[PDB]
Coordinates of N, CA and C in Angstrom, one line a residue:
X1259 N -25.7 -1.0 -18.5 CA -24.2 -1.2 -18.6 C -23.6 -1.0 -17.2
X1260 N -22.5 -1.6 -16.9 CA -21.8 -1.4 -15.6 C -20.3 -1.0 -15.9
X1261 N -19.6 -0.7 -14.8 CA -18.2 -0.4 -14.5 C -18.1 0.8 -13.6
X1262 N -17.0 1.0 -12.9 CA -16.6 2.0 -12.0 C -17.5 2.1 -10.8
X1263 N -17.1 3.0 -9.9 CA -18.0 3.4 -8.7 C -18.8 4.6 -9.2
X1264 N -20.0 4.7 -8.6 CA -21.1 5.7 -8.9 C -21.4 5.6 -10.4
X1265 N -22.1 6.6 -11.0 CA -22.3 6.8 -12.4 C -21.4 7.9 -12.9
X1266 N -21.5 8.3 -14.1 CA -20.7 9.2 -14.8 C -21.4 9.7 -16.1
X1267 N -21.1 10.9 -16.6 CA -21.6 11.3 -17.9 C -20.5 12.0 -18.7
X1268 N -20.8 12.7 -19.7 CA -19.9 13.6 -20.5 C -20.7 14.8 -20.9
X1269 N -20.1 15.8 -21.4 CA -20.7 17.0 -22.1 C -21.5 16.6 -23.4
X1270 N -21.4 15.4 -23.9 CA -22.4 14.9 -24.8 C -23.5 14.2 -24.1
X1271 N -23.2 13.4 -23.1 CA -24.2 12.4 -22.6 C -25.2 13.0 -21.7
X1272 N -25.0 14.1 -21.1 CA -26.0 14.9 -20.3 C -27.1 15.5 -21.2
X1273 N -26.9 15.6 -22.5 CA -27.8 16.3 -23.4 C -28.3 15.3 -24.4
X1274 N -27.4 14.5 -25.0 CA -27.8 13.6 -26.2 C -28.3 12.3 -25.7
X1275 N -27.7 11.7 -24.6 CA -28.1 10.4 -24.0 C -26.9 9.7 -23.5
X1276 N -27.0 9.0 -22.3 CA -25.9 8.3 -21.8 C -25.6 7.0 -22.5
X1277 N -24.3 6.7 -22.8 CA -23.6 6.2 -24.0 C -24.4 5.6 -25.2
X1278 N -25.6 5.1 -24.9 CA -26.6 4.9 -25.9 C -27.8 5.7 -25.5
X1279 N -28.6 5.2 -24.5 CA -29.8 5.7 -24.1 C -30.2 5.2 -22.7
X1280 N -29.2 5.0 -21.8 CA -29.3 4.2 -20.6 C -30.3 4.8 -19.6
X1281 N -30.4 6.1 -19.6 CA -31.3 7.0 -18.8 C -30.8 8.4 -19.1
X1282 N -31.5 9.4 -18.6 CA -31.0 10.7 -18.3 C -31.0 11.0 -16.8
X1283 N -30.1 11.8 -16.3 CA -30.1 12.1 -14.9 C -31.3 13.0 -14.5
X1284 N -31.5 13.0 -13.1 CA -32.4 13.8 -12.4 C -31.9 15.2 -12.3
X1285 N -32.7 16.2 -12.5 CA -32.4 17.6 -12.1 C -32.3 17.7 -10.6
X1286 N -32.8 16.7 -9.9 CA -32.7 16.6 -8.4 C -31.5 15.8 -7.9
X1287 N -30.5 15.3 -8.7 CA -29.6 14.2 -8.2 C -28.2 14.7 -8.2
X1288 N -27.3 13.9 -7.5 CA -25.9 14.0 -7.7 C -25.3 13.0 -8.7
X1289 N -24.3 13.4 -9.4 CA -23.6 12.7 -10.5 C -22.2 13.2 -10.6
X1290 N -21.4 12.6 -11.6 CA -20.0 12.9 -11.9 C -19.9 13.1 -13.4
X1291 N -19.0 14.0 -13.9 CA -18.8 14.1 -15.3 C -17.4 14.7 -15.7
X1292 N -16.7 13.9 -16.6 CA -15.5 14.4 -17.2 C -15.9 15.3 -18.4
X1293 N -15.0 16.2 -18.7 CA -15.0 17.0 -19.9 C -13.8 17.9 -20.0
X1294 N -13.5 18.5 -21.1 CA -12.4 19.5 -21.3 C -12.9 20.9 -21.1
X1295 N -12.2 21.7 -20.2 CA -12.7 23.0 -19.9 C -12.5 23.9 -21.1
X1296 N -13.6 24.6 -21.6 CA -13.4 25.6 -22.7 C -12.5 26.7 -22.2
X1297 N -11.6 27.1 -23.1 CA -10.7 28.3 -22.9 C -11.6 29.5 -22.7
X1298 N -11.1 30.5 -21.9 CA -11.8 31.7 -21.5 C -13.0 31.5 -20.6
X1299 N -13.7 30.3 -20.7 CA -15.0 30.1 -20.0 C -14.9 30.3 -18.5
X1300 N -13.8 29.9 -17.9 CA -13.5 30.0 -16.4 C -13.5 31.5 -16.0
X1301 N -14.6 32.0 -15.6 CA -14.8 33.2 -14.8 C -14.6 32.7 -13.3
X1302 N -13.9 33.5 -12.5 CA -13.9 33.3 -11.0 C -14.3 34.6 -10.4
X1303 N -14.9 34.5 -9.2 CA -15.4 35.7 -8.6 C -14.2 36.6 -8.2
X1304 N -14.2 37.9 -8.3 CA -13.0 38.7 -8.0 C -12.7 38.7 -6.5
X1305 N -13.6 38.4 -5.7 CA -13.6 38.5 -4.3 C -13.9 37.2 -3.6
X1306 N -14.2 36.1 -4.4 CA -14.7 34.8 -3.8 C -14.2 33.7 -4.7
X1307 N -14.3 32.5 -4.1 CA -13.8 31.2 -4.7 C -14.8 30.6 -5.7
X1308 N -16.0 31.3 -5.9 CA -16.9 31.0 -6.9 C -16.2 30.9 -8.3
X1309 N -16.7 29.9 -9.1 CA -16.3 29.8 -10.5 C -17.5 29.6 -11.3
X1310 N -17.4 29.9 -12.6 CA -18.3 29.5 -13.6 C -17.4 29.1 -14.8
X1311 N -17.4 27.9 -15.3 CA -16.8 27.4 -16.5 C -17.7 26.6 -17.3
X1312 N -17.3 26.3 -18.5 CA -18.0 25.4 -19.4 C -17.0 24.2 -19.7
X1313 N -17.5 23.0 -19.9 CA -16.7 21.8 -20.2 C -17.4 21.2 -21.5
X1314 N -16.5 20.8 -22.4 CA -17.0 20.3 -23.7 C -16.2 19.0 -24.0
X1315 N -16.5 18.3 -25.1 CA -15.7 17.3 -25.7 C -16.0 17.4 -27.2
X1316 N -15.6 16.5 -28.0 CA -15.8 16.4 -29.4 C -17.3 16.3 -29.8
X1317 N -18.3 16.4 -28.9 CA -19.7 16.1 -29.0 C -20.5 17.3 -28.7
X1318 N -20.5 17.7 -27.4 CA -21.4 18.8 -26.9 C -20.6 19.6 -25.8
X1319 N -21.4 20.5 -25.1 CA -20.8 21.1 -23.9 C -21.9 21.2 -22.8
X1320 N -21.4 21.4 -21.6 CA -22.2 21.7 -20.3 C -21.5 22.8 -19.5
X1321 N -22.3 23.5 -18.7 CA -21.8 24.5 -17.9 C -21.5 23.9 -16.5
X1322 N -20.7 24.6 -15.7 CA -20.3 24.2 -14.4 C -20.2 25.5 -13.5
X1323 N -21.1 25.5 -12.5 CA -20.8 26.3 -11.3 C -20.0 25.4 -10.4
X1324 N -18.9 25.9 -9.9 CA -18.2 25.4 -8.7 C -18.1 26.6 -7.7
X1325 N -17.9 26.3 -6.5 CA -17.5 27.3 -5.5 C -16.6 26.6 -4.5
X1326 N -15.3 27.0 -4.5 CA -14.4 26.5 -3.5 C -13.0 26.4 -4.0
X1327 N -12.2 25.5 -3.3 CA -10.8 25.4 -3.4 C -10.6 24.5 -4.6
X1328 N -10.1 25.1 -5.7 CA -10.0 24.5 -7.0 C -8.7 23.7 -7.1
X1329 N -8.7 22.6 -7.8 CA -7.4 21.9 -8.0 C -6.4 22.8 -8.6
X1330 N -5.2 22.9 -8.1 CA -4.2 23.8 -8.5 C -3.7 23.3 -9.9
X1331 N -4.0 22.1 -10.3 CA -3.9 21.6 -11.7 C -5.0 22.0 -12.6
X1332 N -6.2 22.3 -12.1 CA -7.3 22.7 -13.0 C -6.9 23.8 -14.0
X1333 N -7.0 23.6 -15.3 CA -6.6 24.6 -16.3 C -7.7 24.7 -17.4
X1334 N -7.6 25.8 -18.1 CA -8.4 26.2 -19.2 C -7.9 25.4 -20.4
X1335 N -8.6 24.3 -20.7 CA -8.2 23.4 -21.8 C -7.6 22.1 -21.3
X1336 N -7.9 21.6 -20.1 CA -7.6 20.2 -19.7 C -8.8 19.4 -19.4
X1337 N -8.7 18.1 -19.4 CA -9.8 17.1 -19.3 C -10.1 16.8 -17.8
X1338 N -10.9 17.7 -17.2 CA -11.2 17.6 -15.8 C -12.3 16.5 -15.5
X1339 N -12.7 16.3 -14.3 CA -13.9 15.6 -13.9 C -14.7 16.5 -13.0
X1340 N -16.0 16.6 -13.1 CA -16.8 17.3 -12.2 C -17.5 16.2 -11.4
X1341 N -18.1 16.6 -10.3 CA -19.1 15.9 -9.5 C -19.7 16.9 -8.6
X1342 N -21.0 16.7 -8.4 CA -21.9 17.5 -7.7 C -23.3 17.2 -8.3
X1343 N -24.1 18.2 -8.6 CA -25.5 18.0 -8.8 C -26.0 18.7 -10.0
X1344 N -27.1 18.2 -10.6 CA -27.6 18.7 -11.8 C -28.4 20.0 -11.5
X1345 N -28.1 21.1 -12.2 CA -28.7 22.4 -12.0 C -30.1 22.5 -12.6
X1346 N -30.1 22.4 -13.9 CA -31.4 22.6 -14.7 C -31.4 21.8 -16.0
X1347 N -30.7 22.3 -17.0 CA -30.7 21.7 -18.3 C -29.5 20.8 -18.5
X1348 N -28.4 21.5 -18.8 CA -27.1 20.9 -19.0 C -26.0 21.6 -18.2
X1349 N -26.3 21.9 -17.0 CA -25.4 22.7 -16.1 C -25.3 21.9 -14.8
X1350 N -24.1 21.8 -14.3 CA -23.7 21.0 -13.1 C -23.3 22.0 -12.0
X1351 N -23.9 21.9 -10.8 CA -23.3 22.4 -9.6 C -22.2 21.4 -9.2
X1352 N -21.0 21.6 -9.7 CA -19.9 20.9 -9.1 C -19.8 21.2 -7.6
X1353 N -19.3 20.2 -6.8 CA -19.1 20.1 -5.4 C -17.6 19.9 -5.1
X1354 N -16.7 19.5 -6.1 CA -15.3 19.4 -5.8 C -14.4 19.8 -7.0
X1355 N -14.7 19.3 -8.2 CA -13.9 19.4 -9.4 C -12.5 18.7 -9.2
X1356 N -12.1 17.9 -10.2 CA -10.9 17.2 -10.2 C -10.2 17.3 -11.5
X1357 N -8.9 17.2 -11.5 CA -8.1 17.5 -12.7 C -7.5 16.3 -13.4
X1358 N -8.1 15.2 -13.3 CA -7.6 13.8 -13.7 C -6.2 13.5 -13.3
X1359 N -5.8 14.1 -12.2 CA -4.5 13.8 -11.4 C -4.6 12.4 -10.8
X1360 N -5.2 11.4 -11.6 CA -5.5 10.0 -11.2 C -6.6 9.9 -10.2
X1361 N -6.4 10.5 -8.9 CA -7.3 10.4 -7.8 C -7.5 9.0 -7.3
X1362 N -7.8 8.9 -6.0 CA -7.9 7.6 -5.3 C -9.0 7.6 -4.2
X1363 N -8.9 8.7 -3.3 CA -9.8 8.9 -2.2 C -9.6 7.8 -1.1
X1364 N -9.0 8.2 0.0 CA -8.8 7.3 1.2 C -10.1 7.3 2.0
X1365 N -10.7 6.1 2.3 CA -12.0 6.0 3.0 C -11.8 6.5 4.5
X1366 N -12.9 6.5 5.3 CA -12.8 6.8 6.7 C -12.1 5.7 7.5
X1367 N -12.3 4.5 7.3 CA -11.9 3.3 8.1 C -10.4 3.0 7.8
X1368 N -9.6 4.0 8.1 CA -8.1 4.0 8.0 C -7.6 5.2 8.7
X1369 N -8.1 6.4 8.4 CA -7.5 7.7 8.9 C -7.6 7.8 10.4
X1370 N -8.9 7.7 10.9 CA -9.2 7.9 12.3 C -10.4 7.1 12.7
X1371 N -10.7 6.1 11.9 CA -11.8 5.1 12.2 C -11.3 3.7 11.9
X1372 N -10.0 3.4 12.1 CA -9.5 2.1 12.6 C -9.9 2.1 14.1

């Protein structure tokens, strides 16, 4: 199947199969995944920007480690997007976390590489 940039999964598709059976990701790879943050799941380090949360949908759930400056929109019970790398089973090392605030990403060849 095609569409969008990169690939993507969900908290069903990382466990059950990508939207039919297209493949499963590598425990060695980078990927992206939307899901709804479970309430209460978001632990954050009392002294650090580390997070641990779970994201689910009407199907299954996955865990997320993130560490860093979290979207100020990110909330307990909204439909976020993760991206980063597969940890082990159904857990993602997020590398950014996004709060479905549309997002766009300006490339290099505009800012200071015109």
